[PDB]
């Protein structure tokens, strides 16, 4: 029914509006920090010697 | 020094080998491309490469190496290569016809067994026909008539020339049937609305004849002591067919063209 | 009844205002002085081939050694990447398979597609072979993507705009998720296995909690449909492909779009997306059979893995980022490294 | 030691993979599409002698495996791309249905399918399965086609049209008009690598299977001819 869909939508909107939010700058900083802290562990980002690389 | 019209053999052989080895390297070398049509294209390329290499070696054998006994082996190699090239052209035409006439079932492995039979029937016949230039009554002692092409007796050369016409007639018939199918499709497509087919056939079925006929006719009609100029003058048309076969059967294909561009670019 | 519509419109306006207020900066602006990646000259190192038809999905195990690939020819061949040796040739009841999974335990596999059934297979058997363990039905929608929570739980997303959680023991739909309007193209489990997002066909991406069983957020920053979803390694973000040729990145806490990747030369939609181990790279496959390695920070292309034909069905990454499998419709799985 | 065992297992299963190849490689897959009231279920049931109604049959020892898309949502803009490898896409049009007017919806759906990027290489076959119903509707004088389609006015029957024996010219005129309307967009943005194959059929007709067989053969022949540069 239209009324049921409207009620469900309005509860969904209220739930999505009453949740906590933070500045986008903090999200960008978190992503940058995670990328920096894990850059020394991904062969894909920086090649590795064939001695240890399985695919070599 | 190699007299006039001798350099033409060398340059033609080099040009044939340059383009056909590339086709061989792509079709046989690169992954995939093992479909029966591509196997029969690779066989044609190998035959043309052998013909070009044989021509180049024969030019070296003429003056540089100067070995009289090497000339017979190189002539046998050249005969084998040309026979294999023409057999591969016939094999490609018969494969096209069989793909059009078993379109639904052409994609079965009954074809791979046929492609292998054709690849082994085309190369056994080439070997058998190129074995004659050594022994088997080929004017090594001069008893049997020779001279039309000195390292080959006239009888064997005439046999090769007649086999050429045998192949040409069958190719004409097969391409006539393919043109019938093409016309059937063309008349149908137009009706839904409101010539590339005949133009492509004019090359596919025309260049082969215009290239190989002069040498074959000379072989049938040429006498033993005919002027040497005729052998060379009619050899360039024959060798031309070997330097346009990759253009006709390999260059036009979209995927082969894609790989060729990737290598070149 | 119109009062409900007015209230919904006011709530949407409030959400927009809150997002604008929280939009104090952008990822592109922040990354104006970050170290560029440069150019990554990755080349194919292992062409598995073998597959008899166009591939549509693939996923590896926890040990990053054995990989499971699913193709629309009905084969689920398991390959040993190190030596290329095949380990199994699990046939599939339904030829059309759009997804597959490899359980963390390393012995259970599952797949599904237009058959509407998420078949389950176990590699460990008394006969040393693979036999059907359980078939999950009752979805009324083609399975777009599935994942393994553990050796006894599987979560699947169908085309009916609903995601469902199943229990292998009793084969029952323990929890059901709903709220989307378009087809759910894909989902990606979080590293903690608690949260997981899903990209609907209507450009709306929603986050759900498996235990709670209800949605939490909704992102509608895409102008067209979303083709693939992949969770960030840190478990707080996820990339989003689309048919409009634009890739975007969202953050759960941000609650809004942060970055968008697109170029004038690119006019082709993205088929699949998968983040790298470190999360600094955003590999994606395009409709022009030309995979591109985007940068999550610079947003500039970091390299093109050309070589696939007619599509790039799906990508993949390891638990340690040791190799990438680039599935394609050409039936060849090329492992780049 | 484990290297040799792994290689032996690979070689052993390679034979089974090759068998799967030589069986699968000889089977042609087709897509069946149409409207809800197009008789798709009826025609499937007639020719037969989960989200997909798998059907298999053999004609001239040729393996055919067409997968119906029943029990699926009406949003076909996504899962249709998965059927790019099918030899042909059987399409059934709910003719005489002029949703109050489903003919326009079918026309728009066909137009979208034709222009779909991934379906360009896949030939689309349109099947009209309500010829008798259309004939009765037009003859009875109810639901005049002209009002729905103003182009029908002053429309002349195509010369190539061949009326069947023992039927009125008006029904042929109408059916050929709708066929031409379909072909108008069918004959655009094609480039010649794929064509449409309209046919007039009925749910009780037994020659449908031979029609699709011949259409598949023609599609393969045209593809081979194009690959050979003869078209
Ligand atoms: C596959 C069968 C081929 C039939 C015969 C085709 C024509 C071959 C002619 C070869 C002539 C060789 C002459 C070499 C003279 C130096």
Curated annotation (Swiss-Prot), chain A:
S-S bridge residues: none
Biological-process GO terms, alphabetical: adenylate cyclase-activating dopamine receptor signaling pathway; cellular response to catecholamine stimulus; cellular response to prostaglandin E stimulus; fibroblast proliferation; G protein-coupled receptor signaling pathway
Keyword set, alphabetical order: Acetylation, Cell membrane, Host-virus interaction, Lipoprotein, Membrane, Methylation, Prenylation, Transducer
Highest taxon of source: Eukaryota
Signal peptide annotation: none
GO CC terms: extracellular exosome; heterotrimeric G-protein complex; membrane; plasma membrane; synapse
Coiled coil: none
Acetylation listed as a keyword: yes
Tissue specificity remark: Expressed in fetal tissues, including testis, adrenal gland, brain, white blood cells and brain.
Any one GO molecular function term: G-protein beta-subunit binding
Cellular localisation: Cell membrane
Membrane topology: Lipid-anchor
Function, as annotated: Guanine nucleotide-binding proteins (G proteins) are involved as a modulator or transducer in various transmembrane signaling systems. The beta and gamma chains are required for the GTPase activity, for replacement of GDP by GTP, and for G protein-effector interaction.
Similarity comment: family membership: Belongs to the G protein gamma family.
Name of this protein: Guanine nucleotide-binding protein G(I)/G(S)/G(O) subunit gamma-2
Organism (species): Homo sapiens
The encoding gene: GNG2
Residue window of the full protein shown: 7 to 62 of 71
Swiss-Prot record, chain B:
Ranges of the Extracellular topological domain: 61-72, 136-160, 225-229
Subcellular compartments: Cell membrane
Keywords of this entry: Cell membrane, G-protein coupled receptor, Glycoprotein, Lipoprotein, Membrane, Palmitate, Phosphoprotein, Receptor, Transducer, Transmembrane, Transmembrane helix
UniProt gene name: GPR3
Cytoplasmic side: 25-36, 95-115, 180-197
Tissue: Expressed predominantly in the central nervous system, and at low levels in the lung, kidney, testis, ovary and eye. Highly expressed in regions of the brain implicated in the Alzheimer disease.
Residues with lipidation of kind S-palmitoyl cysteine: 265
Family: Belongs to the G-protein coupled receptor 1 family.
GO terms under biological process: adenylate cyclase-activating G protein-coupled receptor signaling pathway; positive regulation of cold-induced thermogenesis; regulation of meiotic nuclear division; regulation of metabolic process
Protein name: G-protein coupled receptor 3
Residues of the full protein shown: 39 to 313 of 330
Keyword Transmembrane helix (UniProt): yes
Expression triggers: Upon cold exposure by a lipolytic signal in thermogenic adipose tissue.
Transmembrane regions: 5-24, 37-60, 73-94, 116-135, 161-179, 198-224, 230-251
Topology term for the membrane: Multi-pass membrane protein
Main location: membrane
GO cellular component terms listed in the entry, alphabetical order: cytoplasm; plasma membrane
GO MF annotation list: G protein-coupled receptor activity; sphingosine-1-phosphate receptor activity
Curated annotation (Swiss-Prot), chain C:
Outcome reported for the amino acid change (mutating residue 61 to V): In MRD42; decreases receptor-driven G protein activation; decreases protein abundance; decreases complex formation with gamma subunit; decreases trimer formation with alpha and gamma subunit
SMART domains: WD40 (SM00320)
WD repeat placement: 43-91, 92-137, 138-178, 179-220, 221-264, 265-306, 307-337
Modified residues (Phosphohistidine): 263
Involvement in disorder: Intellectual developmental disorder, autosomal dominant 42: A disorder characterized by significantly below average general intellectual functioning associated with impairments in adaptive behavior and manifested during the developmental period. MRD42 patients manifest global developmental delay commonly accompanied by hypotonia, seizures of various types, ophthalmological manifestations, and poor growth.
Subunit structure: G proteins are composed of 3 units, alpha, beta and gamma. The heterodimer formed by GNB1 and GNG2 interacts with ARHGEF5. The heterodimer formed by GNB1 and GNG2 interacts with GRK2. Forms a complex with GNAO1 and GNG3. Interacts with ARHGEF18 and RASD2. Forms complexes with TAS2R14 and G-proteins; these complexes play a role in the perception of bitterness. Component of the TAS2R14-GNAI1 complex, consisting of TAS2R14, GNAI1, GNB1 and GNG2. Component of the TAS2R14-GNAT3 complex, consisting of TAS2R14, GNAT3, GNB1 and GNG2.
Cellular component per GO, a single term: synapse
From Swiss-Prot, chain D:
UniProt region (G3 motif), positions on chain: 64-73
PROSITE patterns: G_ALPHA
Effect of residue 229 to K: In PHP1C; significantly reduces receptor-mediated activation; displays normal receptor-independent activation
Consequence of changing residue 225 to R: In PHP1C; significantly reduces receptor-mediated activation; displays normal receptor-independent activation
Gene Ontology biological process: activation of adenylate cyclase activity; adenylate cyclase-activating adrenergic receptor signaling pathway; adenylate cyclase-activating dopamine receptor signaling pathway; adenylate cyclase-activating G protein-coupled receptor signaling pathway; bone development; cellular response to catecholamine stimulus; cellular response to glucagon stimulus; cellular response to prostaglandin E stimulus
Gene Ontology molecular function, alphabetical: adenylate cyclase activator activity; D1 dopamine receptor binding; G protein activity; G-protein beta/gamma-subunit complex binding; GTP binding; GTPase activity; metal ion binding
Residues found modified as Phosphoserine: 189
Stretch list, region G5 motif: 201-206
Record note on what altering residue 72 to H does: In pituitary adenomas; also found in a patient with severe Cushing syndrome
Membrane disposition: Lipid-anchor
Chain positions recorded as Mg(2+) binding sites: 41
Annotated spans, G4 motif: 125-132
SMART domains the UniProt entry points to: G_alpha
Key word Ubl conjugation present: yes
Cross-link Glycyl lysine isopeptide (Lys-Gly) (interchain with G-Cter in ubiquitin) mapped to chain: 137
EC nos: 3.6.5.-
UniProt-reported outcome of changing residue 72 to L: Increases binding to GAS2L2
Keyword RNA-binding attributed: no
Transmembrane segments: none
Pfam families according to UniProt: G-alpha
Family in the record: Belongs to the G-alpha family. G(s) subfamily.
Protein name, entry field: Guanine nucleotide-binding protein G(s) subunit alpha isoforms short
Organism listed in the record: Homo sapiens (Human)
């Amino acid at each position: 029914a239209s009324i049921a869909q409207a009620r469900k939508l309005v509860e969904q909107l209220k739930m999505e509006a009453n949740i906590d939010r933070i500045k986008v700058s903090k999200a960008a900083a978190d992503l940058m920090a995670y990328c920096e802290a894990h850059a020394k562990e991904d062969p894909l980002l920086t090649p590795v010697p064939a001695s240890e690389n399985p695919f070599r | 020094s190699p007299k006039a019209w001798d350099v033409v053999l060398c340059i033609s052989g080099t040009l044939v080998s340059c383009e056909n080895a590339l086709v061989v390297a792509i079709i046989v070398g690169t992954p995939a491309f093992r479909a029966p049509m591509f196997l029969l294209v690779g066989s044609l390329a190998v035959a043309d490469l052998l013909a070009g290499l044989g021509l180049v070696l024969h030019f070296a054998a003429v003056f540089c190496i100067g070995s009289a006994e090497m000339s017979l082996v190189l002539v046998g190699v050249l005969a084998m290569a040309f026979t294999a090239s023409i057999g591969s052209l016939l094999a490609i035409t018969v494969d096209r016809y069989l793909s059009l006439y078993n379109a639904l079932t052409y994609y079965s492995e009954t074809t791979v067994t046929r492609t292998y039979v054709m690849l082994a029937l085309v190369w056994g016949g080439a070997l058998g026909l190129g074995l004659l230039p050594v022994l088997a009554w080929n004017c090594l002692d001069g008893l049997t008539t020779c001279g039309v092409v000195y390292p080959l007796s006239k009888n064997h050369l005439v046999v090769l020339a007649i086999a050429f016409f045998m192949v040409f007639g069958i190719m004409l018939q097969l391409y006539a049937q393919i043109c019938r199918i093409v016309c059937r499709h063309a008349q149908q497509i137009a009706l839904q609305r409101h010539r590339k087919g005949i133009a492509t056939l004019a090359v596919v079925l025309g260049a082969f004849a215009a290239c190989w006929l002069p040498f074959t006719v000379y072989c049938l009609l040429g006498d033993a002591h005919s002027p040497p100029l005729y052998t060379y003058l009619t050899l360039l048309p024959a060798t031309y067919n070997s330097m346009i076969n990759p253009i006709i059967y390999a260059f036009r294909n979209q995927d082969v063209q894609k790989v060729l561009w990737a290598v070149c670019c | 009844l119109d009062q409900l519509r007015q209230e919904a419109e006011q709530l949407k306006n409030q959400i927009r205002d809150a997002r604008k207020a929280c939009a104090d900066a952008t990822l592109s602006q922040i990354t104006n002085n970050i170290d560029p990646v440069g150019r990554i000259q990755m080349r194919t190192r292992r062409t598995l081939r073998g597959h008899l038809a166009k591939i549509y999905a693939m996923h590896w195990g926890t040990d990053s050694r054995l990989l499971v690939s699913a193709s629309q020819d009905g084969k689920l061949i398991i390959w040993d990447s190190y030596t290329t040796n095949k380990v199994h040739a699990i046939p599939l009841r339904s030829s059309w398979v759009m997804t597959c999974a490899y359980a963390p335990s390393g012995n259970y596999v599952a797949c599904g597609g237009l058959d509407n059934i998420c078949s389950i297979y176990n590699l460990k058997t008394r006969e040393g072979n693979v036999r059907v363990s359980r078939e999950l039905a009752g979805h009324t929608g083609y399975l777009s993507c599935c994942r393994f929570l553990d050796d006894n739980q599987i979560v699947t997303s169908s085309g009916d705009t609903t995601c469902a959680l199943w229990d292998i023991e009793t084969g029952q739909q323990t929890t059901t998720f709903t709220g989307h309007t378009g087809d759910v193209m894909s989902l990606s489990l979080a590293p903690d296995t608690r949260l997981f997002v899903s990209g609907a066909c209507d450009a709306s991406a929603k986050l759900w909690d498996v235990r709670e069983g209800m949605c939490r957020q909704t992102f509608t920053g895409h102008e067209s449909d979303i083709n693939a979803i992949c969770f960030f390694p840190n478990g707080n973000a996820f990339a989003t492909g689309s048919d409009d040729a634009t890739c975007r990145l969202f953050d759960l806490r941000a609650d809004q779009e942060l970055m968008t990747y697109s170029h004038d030369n690119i006019i082709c939609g993205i088929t699949s997306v998968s983040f790298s181990k470190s999360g600094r790279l955003l590999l994606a496959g395009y409709d022009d059979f030309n995979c591109n390695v985007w940068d999550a920070l610079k947003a500039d292309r970091a390299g093109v893995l050309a070589g696939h034909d007619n599509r790039v069905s799906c990508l993949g990454v390891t638990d340690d980022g040791m190799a990438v499998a680039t599935g394609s419709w050409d039936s060849f799985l090329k492992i780049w490294n | 030691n484990e290297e040799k065992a792994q290689r032996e297992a690979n070689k052993k299963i390679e034979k089974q993979l090759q068998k799967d190849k030589q069986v699968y490689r000889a089977t042609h897959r087709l897509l069946l599409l149409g409207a809800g009231e197009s008789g798709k279920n009826t025609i499937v049931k007639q020719m037969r002698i989960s989200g997909i109604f798998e059907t298999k049959f053999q004609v001239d020892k040729v393996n055919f495996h067409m997968f119906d898309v029943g029990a699926q949502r009406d949003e076909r803009r996504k899962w249709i791309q998965c059927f790019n490898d099918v030899t042909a896409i059987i399409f059934v049009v709910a003719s005489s249905s002029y949703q109050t007017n489903r003919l326009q919806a079918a026309l728009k759906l066909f137009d979208s399918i034709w222009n779909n990027k991934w379906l360009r290489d896949t030939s689309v076959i349109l099947f009209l399965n309500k010829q008798d119903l259309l004939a009765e509707k037009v003859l009875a004088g109810k639901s005049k086609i002209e009002d729905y389609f103003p182009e029908f006015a002053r429309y002349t029957t195509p010369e190539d049209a061949t009326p069947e024996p023992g039927e009125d010219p008006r029904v042929t005129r109408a059916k050929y008009f709708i066929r031409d309307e379909f072909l108008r967009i069918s004959t655009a943005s094609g480039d010649g690598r794929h064509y449409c194959y309209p046919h007039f059929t009925c749910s009780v007709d037994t020659e449908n299977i031979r029609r699709v067989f011949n259409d598949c053969r023609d599609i393969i022949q045209r593809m081979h001819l194009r690959q050979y540069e003869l078209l």
